[PDB]
Structures are given as C-alpha cells and as structure tokens.
Design an enzyme around this catalytic site. Sequence first.
Site, PDB file in Angstrom:
ATOM      1  N   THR G   1      40.943  39.371  46.280  1.00  0.00           N
ATOM      2  CA  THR G   1      42.333  39.093  45.955  1.00  0.00           C
ATOM      3  C   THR G   1      43.097  38.727  47.223  1.00  0.00           C
ATOM      4  OG1 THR G   1      42.418  40.484  43.952  1.00  0.00           O
ATOM      5  CG2 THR G   1      44.495  40.086  45.098  1.00  0.00           C
TER       6      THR G   1
HETATM    7  C1  LIG Z   1      41.910  41.827  43.717  1.00  0.00           C
HETATM    8  O1  LIG Z   1      42.241  42.711  44.482  1.00  0.00           O
HETATM    9  C2  LIG Z   1      40.973  42.121  42.560  1.00  0.00           C
HETATM   10  C3  LIG Z   1      41.455  41.513  41.224  1.00  0.00           C
HETATM   11  O2  LIG Z   1      40.435  41.650  40.229  1.00  0.00           O
HETATM   12  C4  LIG Z   1      42.675  42.119  40.513  1.00  0.00           C
HETATM   13  C5  LIG Z   1      42.996  41.186  39.369  1.00  0.00           C
HETATM   14  C6  LIG Z   1      44.116  41.329  38.677  1.00  0.00           C
HETATM   15  C7  LIG Z   1      45.394  41.581  39.427  1.00  0.00           C
HETATM   16  C8  LIG Z   1      45.123  42.690  40.426  1.00  0.00           C
HETATM   17  C9  LIG Z   1      43.954  42.313  41.321  1.00  0.00           C
HETATM   18  N1  LIG Z   1      40.770  43.545  42.381  1.00  0.00           N
HETATM   19  C10 LIG Z   1      39.494  43.892  42.318  1.00  0.00           C
HETATM   20  O3  LIG Z   1      39.073  45.012  42.119  1.00  0.00           O
HETATM   21  C11 LIG Z   1      38.603  42.715  42.522  1.00  0.00           C
HETATM   22  C12 LIG Z   1      37.651  42.963  43.664  1.00  0.00           C
HETATM   23  C13 LIG Z   1      38.348  42.393  44.885  1.00  0.00           C
HETATM   24  O4  LIG Z   1      39.481  41.657  44.412  1.00  0.00           O
HETATM   25  C14 LIG Z   1      39.576  41.654  42.989  1.00  0.00           C
HETATM   26  C15 LIG Z   1      39.198  40.252  42.534  1.00  0.00           C
END
Ligand SMILES: *C(=O)[C@]1([C@@H](O)[C@@H]2C=CCCC2)NC(=O)[C@@H]2CCO[C@@]21C
Lengths: 237, 230, 221, 236, 242, 204, 202, 240
Positions: G1
Amino acid sequence: NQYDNDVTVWSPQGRIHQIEYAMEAVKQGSATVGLKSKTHAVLVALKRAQSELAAHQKKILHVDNHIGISIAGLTADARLLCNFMRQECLDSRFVFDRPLPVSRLVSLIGSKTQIPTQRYGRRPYGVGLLIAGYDDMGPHIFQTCPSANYFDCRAMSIGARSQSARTYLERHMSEFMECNLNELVKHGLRALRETLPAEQDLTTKNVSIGIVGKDLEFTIYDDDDVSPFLEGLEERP
Amino acid sequence: GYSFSLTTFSPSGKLVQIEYALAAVAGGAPSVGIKAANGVVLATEKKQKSILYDERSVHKVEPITKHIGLVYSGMGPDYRVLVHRARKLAQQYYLVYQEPIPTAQLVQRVASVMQEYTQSGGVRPFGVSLLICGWNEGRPYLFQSDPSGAYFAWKATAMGKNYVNGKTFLEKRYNEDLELEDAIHTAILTLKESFEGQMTEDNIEVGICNEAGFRRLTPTEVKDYLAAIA
Amino acid sequence: TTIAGVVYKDGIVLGADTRATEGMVVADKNCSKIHFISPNIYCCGAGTAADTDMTTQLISSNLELHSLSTGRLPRVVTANRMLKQMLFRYQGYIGAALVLGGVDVTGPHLYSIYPHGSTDKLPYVTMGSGSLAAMAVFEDKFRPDMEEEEAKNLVSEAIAAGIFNDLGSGSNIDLCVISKNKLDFLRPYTVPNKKGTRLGRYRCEKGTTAVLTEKITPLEI
Amino acid sequence: SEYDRGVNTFSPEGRLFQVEYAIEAIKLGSTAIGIQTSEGVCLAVEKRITSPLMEPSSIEKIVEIDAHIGCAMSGLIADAKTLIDKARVETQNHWFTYNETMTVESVTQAVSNLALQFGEEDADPGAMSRPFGVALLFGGVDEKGPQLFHMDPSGTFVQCDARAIGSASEGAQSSLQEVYHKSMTLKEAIKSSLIILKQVMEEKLNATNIELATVQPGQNFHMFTKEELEEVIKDI
Amino acid sequence: GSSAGFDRHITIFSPEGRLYQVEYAFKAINQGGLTSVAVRGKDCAVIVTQKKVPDKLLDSSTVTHLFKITENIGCVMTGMTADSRSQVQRARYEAANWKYKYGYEIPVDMLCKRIADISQVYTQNAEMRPLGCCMILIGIDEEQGPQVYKCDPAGYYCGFKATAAGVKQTESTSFLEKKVKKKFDWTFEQTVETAITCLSTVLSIDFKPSEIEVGVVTVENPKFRILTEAEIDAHLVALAER
Amino acid sequence: SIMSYNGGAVMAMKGKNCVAIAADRRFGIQAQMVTTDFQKIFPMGDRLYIGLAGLATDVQTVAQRLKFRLNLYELKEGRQIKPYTLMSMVANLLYEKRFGPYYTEPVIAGLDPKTFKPFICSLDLIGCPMVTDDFVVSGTCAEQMYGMCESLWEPNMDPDHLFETISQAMLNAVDRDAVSGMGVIVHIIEKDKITTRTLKARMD
Amino acid sequence: TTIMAVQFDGGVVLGADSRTTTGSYIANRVTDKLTPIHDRIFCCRSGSAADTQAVADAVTYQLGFHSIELNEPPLVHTAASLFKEMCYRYREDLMAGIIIAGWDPQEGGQVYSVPMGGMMVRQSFAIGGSGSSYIYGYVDATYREGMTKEECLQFTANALALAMERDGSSGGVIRLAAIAESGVERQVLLGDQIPKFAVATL
Amino acid sequence: TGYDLSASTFSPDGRVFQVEYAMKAVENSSTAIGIRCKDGVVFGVEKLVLSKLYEEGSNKRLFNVDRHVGMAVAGLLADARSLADIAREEASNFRSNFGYNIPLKHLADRVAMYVHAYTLYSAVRPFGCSFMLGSYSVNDGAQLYMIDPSGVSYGYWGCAIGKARQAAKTEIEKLQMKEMTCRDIVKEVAKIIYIVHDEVKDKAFELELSWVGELTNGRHEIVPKDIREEAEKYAKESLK
Ligand SMILES: *C(=O)[C@]1([C@@H](O)[C@@H]2C=CCCC2)NC(=O)[C@@H]2CCO[C@@]21C
Ligand SMILES: *C(=O)[C@]1([C@@H](O)[C@@H]2C=CCCC2)NC(=O)[C@@H]2CCO[C@@]21C
C-alpha cells in the site's frame, strides 16, 4: 398538607418543606461557636447529655491534622459526613502527597448533601456543621446547612439560642484578627456563655475546645486540659 | 419505573382495567372477518376526517408473514406495537424451525404478550383487539385476541362500533359453502350496515388470505367489488 | 468450493458448484451454495458451511423484517452493511466468505464479503479454493455490458474451470440470473460429471445375513 | 392512613418519625440496669415471664460479645440478634487483623453505624426497611478500665456511669442517681442494682426471674449462676 | 365523562376507555400561542410558522421553530419548547443511526413512525408523562415525491396534502380543505402563496418579513432550505399585488 | 481426536416407502471395552429415529436435551413433528454451542407423519444439514461405510432387500475398524410396523 | 500500500494505489483507498482493510451527527481527533494507519497523520504504507514550499509511480483527489498516464 | 385536586405546575444581569449579605465553567452549584473527544437538555435555579444565553434574572449596547444594579462583576478591583 411529606415536591410558594424541617433539627441541637484570628482557628462546644451519669456527648471530631468539625443535629448523619471527609483527605494525601484545601472539602460536602434533596424517597442530612481548618491561605471557619448551602464565616454560632452568641460575636468581631490564642478562646467562651440560662455557668465538664493553627495540629482540649482557658473569665453581667 | 401492578382485583372479582380497555375497543372503527372455504377476508373502515389526509400512508390491514394477516379495533399506536412484536415472533420461529409459523402459534405468542401487560409493573393493558387470518395445512384460520390475552377461533365475527348488530347480520348471512368472492361481498355488506355516508374504495380497507398468501386489495379491486355490491 | 458472479447489462449472474467435503472425502454431491436473501438479493457462500448457513439465514430474516416495516423493496447495500458489521464483530471467527448479488432501484450490485468484515464492490468476483481458476477465465474473457446468454456461458466456464482444476470443487453447476423483470434459479444448469455404469450385481439375496434376535412392533393408522 | 409518609420523612419539629416511634417501642420492654465501678461493670435485667409453663432459661437478655464485652438488651429482642452478630464479627475481625482486643467504644460505634441504615429506594437488595426497636447497654473492660455505653435506635451512643433502660427507666434512673458514687465496690453495685430492680419489677424478685452478669479486670465475662444469685438475693 | 381512581393523574384507562393525560397533553400544545401550516405541491413542500419576538433584548436568530433533521428532512415544532428540542434531538439521532445501520438516508415516513413509536411508550408507562409538542416533517422521497407528515403526543402519525398545527388549527384546516377541493397542481410560488395566505387569513395579520418563517424543499434542490428575509419579502409583495 | 475416544458407527439408508437405521453396540474407553449394549439410536416419534455418534457423554446429553425440546414442541403444537423440522431443531441446538461444541454427529431417519415419505439426513459437528436420497453415515469408520454403501445401494428397494443391504454394509465396514463393532442393531421403519433386529457379528 | 497527501495554498492533494493482497494474490486490483469522511474531508487508509473500513464508517457517523448539531461545516482537526481517539483506544486490536486531509474555512488545507498506535501529527506532506519506504529520499529531495495544485498533482503522481515500481504490495492505477473550497476533483491515472522512469540496461 | 404534586402529571389545561413552582423559587432570588457588546460580555450580581459575620466572597453567584465560559446564577444555590459542575463536565468531555473549546450554543443546549430531563418524572424534582452563560471567541464572537427551570435556552443582548427582572430589563433597553465597549458596560451594569436594589426590604449587598472579551483574551475573570470601585463610585453618584 400534601406538600410537606416529600423532598421532591415544590410548594406553590416555591419552597421545599422537608428541607426546612431538617433545618429545625439543627436549631434544636446544642450550641457551638467558631472564630478565627490571623493565625489560629477555635471551635468551642457546649457538651451535654441526658443525665449526670451520662457523659456529655461528643461534639468536636477530628478529621485531619489541619481540619476539625463541630456538630449540631443528628449524630449518625454527622458521623457519615465525618467519614466521607476523612476519606477525601486521605485520598488527597495518597494521590498528591499534600493536604486537601479546606474550601475544596466544603465543596465536596455540598455536592454530597445536595443529591438526596432531589431524589424520591431520600431525605436531607439533618446535621449542621462548623469546620475549622488551616491551609496555605490561612485559617478558615466554614458553616454547613442541611440545605446543602455552605458559608465562609469570620465567626459563627449554630444550635439552640445561638442568636445571642451571634450578637455577642458581631459586637466584638473587629478585635479577633489581632488576638492571641488565649484571648481568642476566651472570646469564644464568652459568646458560648451567652446562650446558657442565667443560672448555668461554664465548667470544665460541659465545655470542649478545638484549636488549629500555623504550627499546631488540630487539638481537642476536654476536661483538665480546658482549665488553663477557663481561668481568668469574669462573671456574667 | 413502577414495580407494582396497576391492574388489580375488585371485591366482585373483576379486573376493571381490562374492562375499560374493552370499552376502548368497543368505541373503535368497525372490523369484520369471514372464513370462506378457500380463504379468509378481513375488512375495516378507515373514515378519515378530511380530504387533507393521504390515504396511502397508513394501513390498518397488515401482513405478518406470507400467509398471516392482521386487523384491529381500538387504539392505533398500541396496534403498531403489537404488529412489531408479532413480526419479530414469527421471525424467531422461522429461525429456529425453518418453517413458516402456524397461525395458532402466532396467536398464542401474541396473546401471551398481551397477558403480560395485565400483570406487569407500571403499565396499562392494550386498548386494542385483534383479528388474525392465516392459511396452514391447506386450511384457513381466523382468530380473535382481546386485551386480556384470550383468543377465540371464529367462523365469522365483527369488532368495534355496532359489533352486536354485525354479529346478528353475520349469523343470518353466513354459510359453510361460501367461496371467497361471496365472503368479500358479505363482509362489505356487514360494513355497510354500520356506515355513515358513501362507501368508496378509499374509506374501507380489505385484505384476503388464500393458498397464494395474504394480500391487501388495491383500491381498483375494491372499486370493482363495490360496483358489484351496489 | 468455487463461487463466482458477474454483472451484465441487465443484471447479475451468480454461479456455484455442488460438492461438500469433510476433509478429503466427499460428503455431499448436491449441495446448494446459492442462498436466498430477498426476492431480488441472493448470496453464494464459501468457507465453514454452518457459519455461512446461519449468517445468511439471520440476515435474510432481518431484511424481511426491514422490508415489512418499510413496505419497499430491499437494497443490496443494506445487506452489505448488515453482513460486514456482523462479521467484523466476530473478528474473523465466523468463517463466511460471500458473494452478494442483487438488483434494486439503483441498478445491479455485486459485492465480495470476506470473513473479517472487508467488502469489495466489483463488476466480477470469485471466491473459494477454486477462485483463482475462475478468476483466470474472468480476466481472459470478461467484457462490460454483456448479454444474458454470454454472461451465463462465461459464469458456467469459470465454474467449470474451478471444477476440473481444484480438488475441493466438483459435481454440477448451479446458476442464478437476477434482472429487474425476472429471476431464474437454475439447479442444475449443466452436468459435467456422471457416475459410470455398474458392471456387476453384488449378490443381494434374502437369508444372507444371520440374525440373533428380532422384535416386530405394529403401528396403528 | 399508614403509608402517606415514607420511612425517611422529617417531622415539622425536625425529628425522623420512625425513630421516634421506635424509641416509643423501647418503653414497652423489660428493665435493664448497668453500673460502672473501678472494679468492673455490672449488668442486671428482668426476665418478663408470662406463663409458669415457660422455661426461664431460654430467655437470653444478656449476651457475651467477647470475653471482655457483654451486652444487655431491651425492647424488640428479635431485632437485637442482627446487631449482636455484627458486634461479634467485628471483634473477631479486629483480633484477626491487629492481634489485639477491641475497645468497647469501637464496638459500640460499629454497631451504631447500622442504626440509621434504612430506606426504600436507592438502597441495595437486602437493606433494612425500618429502624431497630432495641436499646443496648454495652459493658466491658479495656485499657481505659471498666466502660459502660448506651445505644438507642437513633444511632446515638453515649458513655454512662449508671444507666437504666426499659419500661421503668425514669424511676430506676432516679434511684440510681440517689445511690451511685464514684467509690462504689462491685459488690455494692450488684446489691444496689438488685434493690432497684426489686423496686420496679411487678413480680417478686427470685433467682429465676432475673439475670446478672459482671466483667472485671482479669476475670472474663461472668453470668451469675442460680446459686450465686441466691447468695446475693439473701441480703436484699 | 366519568372517572375512577388515578385515571386523571396517570396514563390508565377511564371507565369509557379514554386516556385523560393524553388529552391534557394535546391541550399543552396550544400553550405558546403559535400556529404552523405545511403544504405539499407538485414538486415542493413548504412549512410556514409564526415568529414572535416579545423582547427587543432577544437575539432573533435563536428564536426559531424550524429545524434541520438531516440535509434533506426539515421540521417545524409546535408546543412546549423544551419538549420540542428533546424530540428534535431524538429525531436527529434516529436518522443518523438509520444511515449508519442500513446505508441509505431515512425515509420521512419511517422517521415519523419511529418518533410516534417512542411517543406511545409514554402513554403506556405510568412513571413518565407525554411530551406537549407536535412535529411536522417535510422531505423528498425519490419514489413518491414531496412528503408532509405529522405526529402528535398520542402516538398517531399520518401523511397529508396540507395540514396545520397550533392555536388556530381548525380554521386553517377549513381554509386548506376549501383550497384543496378546487384542485390545482401547485407550483412552488402557488404553494408558498397558499401557505402564507392561510396563515394571514386565519390570524388576521398582514405579515412583515420578520413575523414569519418559511422553510422549503424541492425536487430540483432536495436540501432543506430556510428562506431569508429578502425572499420572504418578494413573496409577500407578490401576494399583495394580487 | 476426541471423537475417536469412544468410537461408534451409525448409518441410515433409504428404500421404497421405508427407511433403515443401523448402529454398533460397543461402549469402551479408548482400547478397553466396557459394555456391549450401548444405546445410540433413540426414538423421536413413532416413525422417526435419531442416531448419534461420537463422545458417549455428549451422545447422552444431546439425546436428553433433544427430547426435552421435542416434548415441549409436541405439547404446544398438538401435532407430531416432521423430520425436516427435527433436523432444523437439532441444527439449532448444535450451533448454540458453536464455540464449545458437542462432540457428536447425528443422523435422522424417518417417515413423514402424514404422507409417509422417507427422509434421511446427516449433521456434522456444528450443524450443517445434509439431506440425501440414498444413504448417510457417521462415525469413526466413515470411509469404510462410504465404500460399502456406494457399492451396494440400489434405488427403490423393498424392506427385505434394504435390510440385507444395510446389514452387509455395516457388518463389513465395522469389521475393518478397531474401535467399532461388538454387534450391530438395525431398525426397519415402515408405515405399519417397526422391525428391530440384532445381527450375528464378530466380538473381537 | 502507498498513500500520500500534500498541502498547497488553498487545499490538499491525496493519492493512492489500487492493490488489495491476500498474501501474494491480488484480490482486488482497482480498489479505492480514498474515503470521503465529509464534503471536504478525506482519509487514506493503510493496514487492515476491515479495520480501516470500520473506523472510517464510525468516524463518518460521528462527524455527520456533530455537524448537524453544530450547524457548521466540520474542521479537519476534529476528524483527525476522532480518528486518533478510536485508534488509540483500540490500538491493541486494530492495524490502521490513516492520513486525514481536508479544507476548512478557518485553517485552510490541512494534512494529519495518524500512524499505528494512535498518535496525531500535522504535516506539510505525509506518506504511508509499505511502499512509502522507497520514496522517502525522493520526497525529501523534491518537496518545495509554495507549490501550486498542478505541481502538487504531478509530484504526487511521480512519487506514487516510483513506489509502485519497487513494491510488490503496491500497484494498479493511481487515484488522485484535489480538495479546495470549490470542492473535490477526482482523477484516475492508468496505463500510459502513469509516469515512466527508464530502467538501467547493460 | 392533586394535579400539582408530580412533574409527570399534566393539569386539565395543559400545565406542569411543579415547574411553575420552581420558577416561583427563582423569582424570590436577588437579581443578576448580563449585557453583551460587540467585543464581550459583562455579568453583574447583587449579592445580599445576610450577616456581617460572613466573609467577602461567601456565596459566590458567578462561576467559571470553562476558561472562556462564565455563569451567573439565581435561585437555589445548591442546585446552581450542581448545574455548574454538570456544565464543567460537559466542557471537559467535549475537549477530550473533539479536541477544541466547546461552542457556547452547544454547551447551552446540552445543559438545557440535562435540566429538561428533570421535568418529566415523579422520581426527580425540577431545578430551582436559572442561569446565564457568557462567552467570547474570535470565530464565534460574543455569546450570551439564558436557561430557565423548564429547560428553555435563548440567546440575548441583555438579560436579567431574579426578583427585579422587569425593572432591570426596562433599564437595559435604554442602552445602545451593540456600539458600546466593555468598559462603559461595566459602569452601566453597576448603575442598573444600584437602581433596582430596594434598601428598605433588603439591607446590604455587594456588587459582583465579571467579564469575557477581547480585552481579556477570551478568558472569563473577575473585574479588577480598581475598575469595580470606579464603577461603584459612578453608580452611587447617579443615585444622588
Ligand atoms: C495496504 O497496506 C494493504 C491493502 O490491502 C489494504 C487495502 C485496503 C485499504 C487498506 C489497505 N494492506 C495489506 O495488508 C496488504 C499487504 C500490504 O499492503 C496491502 C496491499
Ligand atoms: C467450500 O468452500 C467448502 C464447502 O464445504 C462449502 C462451504 C460452504 C457452503 C457449503 C459447502 N468448504 C469447505 O470447508 C470445503 C473445503 C474446500 O471447499 C469445501 C468443499
């Protein structure tokens, strides 16, 4: 009367008759005087009981090293309030390592006493209090009424026939600020003598004294301890 | 709250608050219920005071489930409270037994709710009586529940203003071999017996239960039936 | 388990398989994983079977209560809110993974709801152990605004991909088509697998089994 | 009517009605007398025996609170059992925590705290509805010597030299006024109390219709047996 | 008009099946001396209320009986002021909670139903009294159009074409009945004119822009709007030039 | 596994206008046999039976609580319960203990009290119902029972052939499981009679 | 993210990636991580999808009620305070990193960071997520005072593209929002709109 | 008949007489006055001294509810003190949840709702006090609200509570207070207080003055002694 049995009922005149009836309890009780100089605070109490075998009932109670109280009215309510005040002072020492200021204690008492006057099936506290204290702002004399109202006084008498004591105190109040301890106590004793019927006098048995000041913990002088003060007191007019 | 009963026994053995609730029921708008061979018809009078009232807003005939329907006589807010309770009870039964609730079971549970208010602390009884219609096991059911908490099973009955005259009318005009259309005509006639003014499709409300379920008639259908009656 | 859903020009197509397993043994061969919520809303369930069942039943009852109260047709966002708040309350201990499809006054809506309470609103979704195999078909062949038959063929293909490539998915293909004008609950829609014919008769004859005691109780009709 | 007023209602004179009525209940009970001397405390009570068929030994108007404290009760005797159990538990808890005996004043104060704890609302389940209809006389020996305390239903407790409670309190109190001096011996106190009790009792004082107990420094709480009672009665 | 027991002091039944405390609560609405009129049109809903400021020491902004429940729902309260504010707070909480739970804006009819349900409890439980206030709600429903609903202290709620509340409710009802019988699907100007004319006629007062409050909702702008003094004066000069 | 502590096997099979339910008889603590007449099939009606497999304490607990609920239902409703309704009731009972599960798996076999249509169903640890038109099994020897039932079952069997099929399946399946066996009991439920039979089995 | 917010004179610019991952599988590839809390207040959510959604919904509810009772537009600081209270109270239970950006008439455009643990700090620009680590030097080298809205949009897009190239948990499309007094403008950058940086080749 | 014994009872004509009796309790109290100008708010209390044994500062009728909010009470002083504590707790909670100083309108609404909750049940008694809240901030300006025992809160330009409220209002209407400064307002407040006081019935009184505005940096405080004594001189001169 349909307005005089509950504390939740207002009369058409805008009064609560139960609170006035509770003030009558303070008016019936024995008389106490309190006064303050610039350095000390004195409580003088007229002890009495039902009979001569019955020792004179305890009127001056110890709350903290800097606070004492005198009682008029229902003694069990007085002990409830005394325990509440003792616990508040102890909590202040536990948390802040300092004594509780006297004005804040009187505020807490007023908060405690007002709640019962607004709820169904409760009653006021039928006790009138006189609080003597010493803190960073000096000596203090406070009065507490069953209506939950509290007053900061230069001097005050409560109890039966205490109007004559209040008259005496008003006449002499300008002297009190400049007095020494024995003179102040003698002033209080003269005021208390003003309430007795003309035949009765002040003896070591029926008088209790309570003193607090800059360098003195709250002390209760009863019995032989009061003889030093009763000495040198002119006869009544 | 108050922890004591407001309904108590009188020296003659009466619970007078329940009788005063029945007096409230007897002053309400007339309701009729008829059990035909193939269905049940519930009919009520909603005679509004003014043209300023929007007739599609509030309904006196309500669905409880797909096959159960309700009508009332008495005090409307209490009726809404009972409707909410009945719908919740039916949903609880469905959640436990995976079956739509039988009409008698719903009537018994709702009557228990009404009994609770004749004995609990700080409350009054419900000033409403209820007519309940249902279709279970290929058979139609009609029930009446009164403020006390008692329930009766009826072939035909009337509630509200002039209910004694409606009862006599239904006695004279009821038959076991009635089909639903004849029953609807008879119910509208019973309502006409105690009606002030012109009966239009907007000052009466009709609902029917058959094998398909319970439904509230649209004003068009009521106009067709009223043209047939007149 | 393979569950899938797409949005087409006039509505929603949901698809599922009919196999239920207890470990690596097949317990049920005709399970129904498409659940009724309201006449316009349906749900496909994956994960723990009991959790899915009870959760969908509870939300369906709550929505029926809401619709009776309001007199209006229920909305898919209401179901979405109810489900995700309930699932977040249990911190992922209710193991329900859901595909939620409906048609309301605002149009066709499709959601993916995860056991921890996370929701995604998407034009196509897959869930289950065969989800990736179905998602490959969707990512290869999906177009926006399809006709009903194209969407049905696509969802059938995705469920078939899950069936033949995942060990936890199999049996038949179930479909649900939701438009504003109609609902089609197609069980079964295609049968890709059958049981072969038996070649032997295992001597079933009376008196082969030896009995110690016998008691006969007559019942009255 | 009885329920126009609540239990926590003040009178126009400033007194709680229920407490005044309970104090009037105190006047209907038996007469108890307590005398304090430098040699100890004497407690004498009258058993009000209504029938010859009653066994006087089941009438307990004097109880042992602890080895150093005893109590005499007047009024509604059934109400007194709760207070006495509280007193016994308090003395034993004090011994458990501090490894010493309680003072008579502390026991009296602990019992007096229960006296006004009555009400209807804003009170926990298991709370009291009315006051206690008992007057209590506590007699004991502690480091301050022999102590005698009086408690009434209002919660007020006082320390007394000589004291009478019950129906005949006024006349008995006058007699105690006449006969009490600070230099009395315990034998004189016992004799004087029995003289007054004989004066006020409507029956004739014999060894089965009264109770006497003493607490002395060094000796524990003692209930007089019938033989010692007859020995004392001979002089009167 | 018989009685037996405490039936005039608590909410229990009288021998005739009446609840006298609810009727007294209805009497409480007329204490205040104000009147309100609500009118529904083709695409608009209008509420007009009487504004009285006895003191020149009062800040006129704070004297208002028009309240905003959500962005799209507006209300006028009639009766005891503190009770009215309590009901407004309850309505705001309920609408917000509906949005949180179900994910869309609360319908006006459902909000009126919830408020009336809350009011019914006060007529069944004896330890509380009813509230001496009447509530009129206006809104736009994206399936049924303009909506005007009213709830009273008894627990009754209804939807109206036009309605009034307050001291002069009966006369206003008669005026509006005559106007609705001669039916014209009302434009925004016609609706506001009708409401203001009803209030003027029934009160016998020629209004100054500061003596009334006007609140509108329309299909084009569905947000609840309170009219400024200039707009009210425009409507009043148009009414006079008739 | 806590299910295998006591062992046990239950099986239900569907015929033409008939149902059959069979169970093993052993009660034992792990490897030790305690008794050979333990009841695992309980009557919930004249033509309705429930069989429980798993931990014996939970077997008895669930049977007794289920009879509590069923008796109350039949008193309040004035009717006899339908097999599907009983399935829902059992599922509700088991899911109320979702995080403190009863360690039992039930099979229900019965005839509809009015139309006399066969019904068999199975429930897992927490209450997911499985309704089948052929057969259901539960216990420690489930794979063995699955093989036997898949090989032997035929549609539209008369009561005698149904008895032979279920008896052979149960006998040969429990002969391959160590903690199941010590006898087999079979109930054949028809419209007009219940037939209970005890089978000649291996006691090793 | 990867989430970002930059303040310019008269408003803010927010930007995010569009990847949801369950391990190494991309569950959603077009997700919206920018949430309207109020009319001129947005949040960028990082961490647990469920936790951030729940917290955002609760804050939206509370802020709407507050704004109705006060009859005023809300402040950005108030929204940040509500987020901070919820994230600090449930810090043991929640994995939520939030950025709150907005415009209010009293203080203008504001950016607040609420990291995990529940602290609240106002910044001129804020970055967050797992990919934010790879662009710390770039934002420190490129940030200058007195940027305009267009320069802020370009700067944010460049940073997000650089983060998406190096992070396996970031990718997809770039979602941008500009908030000023006149309102909110939202953009999507996909494909060839995403800035490209040449890769080193031997 | 007993239509006036409970706050959960209506009279046949639609009145709750218990709240009216509480209002009667307020009318017996001594008079408090509040005047608002473009830059601030000034509070004045006539504080009767019932004996010479009482100190200066006994029975204060002016409270600090928040560092920017002040309170002037009339009626039953114990009820007023409990209400002051309620208002203080409301302000503290608002700062702890939303992170800034509570607006005066919101505080008045919350306290008025708390007061209204006591006018509905037989289990509680209405409050026998009326009070004024006053505040200043740069964003909101100067605000003065008044709350009565029923729970009605209104905004004012000048307000008076207690025994001589009507005469005080008559005097307040003679001031063009919008274009006045806080210094002038203090002298006018003192003058009005001295006008409405009845020396024959009420013996002696102190003047209690406080203010909040840009002059004080939005902090509510007691008027400094020199300003107070100058204003008292002006008031005593005006009475001849
Ligand atoms: C980002 O931190 C992330 C997202 O899946 C998540 C999606 C919806 C909004 C909040 C952020 N969180 C996670 O656990 C995964 C792993 C690393 O980043 C993600 C894609
Ligand atoms: C599918 O996910 C699956 C099925 O049991 C399925 C679950 C929900 C609806 C009922 C049937 N769940 C499982 O635990 C197994 C493992 C893989 O897929 C299953 C068959």
